[PDB]
């Protein structure tokens, strides 16, 4: 798996590959790893599919109940609920979640939650097995306040490299754009991104 989320001028973009393997066999080549927990709060999932699916569903439940009582939750609050579940059940979970969201006040935000259940607010985040190969690339190429098109290009170039080298990554590059305008689903096929 190769996943990332990048803040930019207008908000935030989540990116992911679509490959899930059991050993060397690709059990799913069109997986959707970009998961909605609220209107404009989404997450990228890595680790045990069972675990991250269960986590995300519980988080989505909490934020639905939060909204009913107290109105729209902040991205921080969503990250806090992920953290609470991951940290308190660290012995029985293998989950690496990136939480990304947009609200009008704070703009775009990215919180990464590694294996232990710690939380780290970052300008951008990368995770999944494929991410190791793009630490160098991303650190030399990321800039703050990029445009939507620049950010889409940064994610597309980054994940294409992660996919190129990581066997556990592949398929299509999915993105989810989060801004004041709303939510936009993007998808990029092998014939485009391999050529980069």
């Amino acid at each position: 798996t190769s996943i990332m989320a990048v803040t930019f001028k207008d908000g935030v973009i989540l990116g992911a590959d679509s490959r899930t393997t059991t050993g060397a066999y690709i059990a799913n080549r069109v997986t959707d790893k970009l998961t909605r927990v609220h209107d404009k709060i989404w997450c990228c999932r890595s680790g045990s599919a069972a675990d991250t699916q269960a986590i995300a569903d519980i988080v989505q439940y909490h934020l639905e109940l939060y909204t009913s009582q107290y109105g729209t939750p902040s991205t921080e609050t969503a990250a806090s609920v992920f953290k609470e579940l991951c940290y308190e059940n660290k012995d029985n979970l293998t989950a690496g979640i990136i939480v990304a969201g947009y609200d009008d006040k704070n703009k775009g935000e990215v919180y990464t939650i590694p294996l232990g259940g710690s939380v780290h607010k970052l300008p951008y985040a990368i995770a999944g097995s494929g991410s190791t190969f793009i630490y160098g690339y991303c650190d030399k190429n990321f800039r703050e306040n990029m445009s939507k098109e620049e950010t889409v290009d940064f994610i597309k170039h980054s994940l294409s490299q992660a996919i190129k080298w990581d066997g556990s990554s592949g398929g299509v590059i999915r993105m989810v754009v989060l801004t004041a305008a709303g939510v936009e689903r993007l998808i990029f096929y092998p014939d485009e991104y391999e050529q980069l």
């Binding site: 899930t20 997986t31 599919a49 069972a50």
Partner: protein, 222 residues
């Protein structure tokens, strides 16, 4: 075991082989692997046979009670959510692997479920020991906007790949077709390409062959 699911333009089909094994021995040459959750939601299971049957009837029972309580046709996402949360609770110890397919008021659906509680969604899926043989056929012939007839053909061909190439699969092909408008049609033994040939000899013994020590009538009545 080989099981597949294939979406088509107005519904979904699932299929399975009919071989049941205990290690390398064949117990049942015509096991029925297509289970019913509700009338229009069907299930094909692999892994620990007792677990697939148990978990399919439990959720089937709760889905019936839910349908009666809500006065609504059961949905495939409900079967999916209940199955996965049950399986996740038991951390893979319930060794059920399922392809669940069906139709309901929200449309037609096709999902896979694994023992630890993860789920996938797709237009074509396969599971079991014949998973890879079947998936090779699906990847070679699947296209979008399939007809009912093309889907049954494709799914049936995929099960055959398992039957012929996978030792864990064999015998017949069971199919069930679920179309948006109509009733689901369960096609038990849709194909029978493994009829055992007539034996060379009859082993009916002459009477008296077996030595008997003692004989008595058993009382059933009271």
């Amino acid at each position: 075991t080989t099981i597949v699911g294939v979406k088509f333009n107005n519904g979904v089909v699932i299929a399975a082989d009919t071989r049941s094994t205990q290690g390398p021995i064949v117990a049942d040459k015509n096991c029925a692997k297509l289970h019913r959750i509700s009338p229009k939601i069907w299930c094909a299971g692999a892994g620990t046979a007792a677990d697939t049957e148990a978990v399919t009837q439990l959720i089937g029972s709760n889905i019936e009670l839910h349908s009666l309580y809500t006065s609504r046709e059961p949905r495939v996402v409900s079967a999916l959510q209940m199955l996965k949360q049950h399986l996740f609770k038991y951390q893979g110890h319930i060794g059920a692997y399922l392809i669940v397919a069906g139709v309901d008021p929200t449309g037609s659906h096709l999902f896979s479920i694994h023992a630890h509680g993860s789920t996938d969604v797709g237009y074509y899926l396969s599971l079991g020991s014949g998973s890879l043989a079947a998936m090779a056929v699906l990847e070679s012939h699947w296209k979008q906007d399939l007809t009912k007839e093309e889907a049954i053909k494709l799914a049936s061909d995929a099960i055959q790949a398992g039957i012929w190439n996978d030792l864990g699969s064999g015998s017949n092909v069971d199919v069930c077709v679920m179309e948006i408008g109509k009733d689901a049609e369960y096609l038990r033994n849709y194909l029978t390409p493994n009829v055992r040939e007539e034996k060379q000899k009859s082993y009916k013994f002459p009477r008296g062959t077996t030595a008997v020590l003692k004989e008595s009538i058993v009382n059933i009545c009271d």
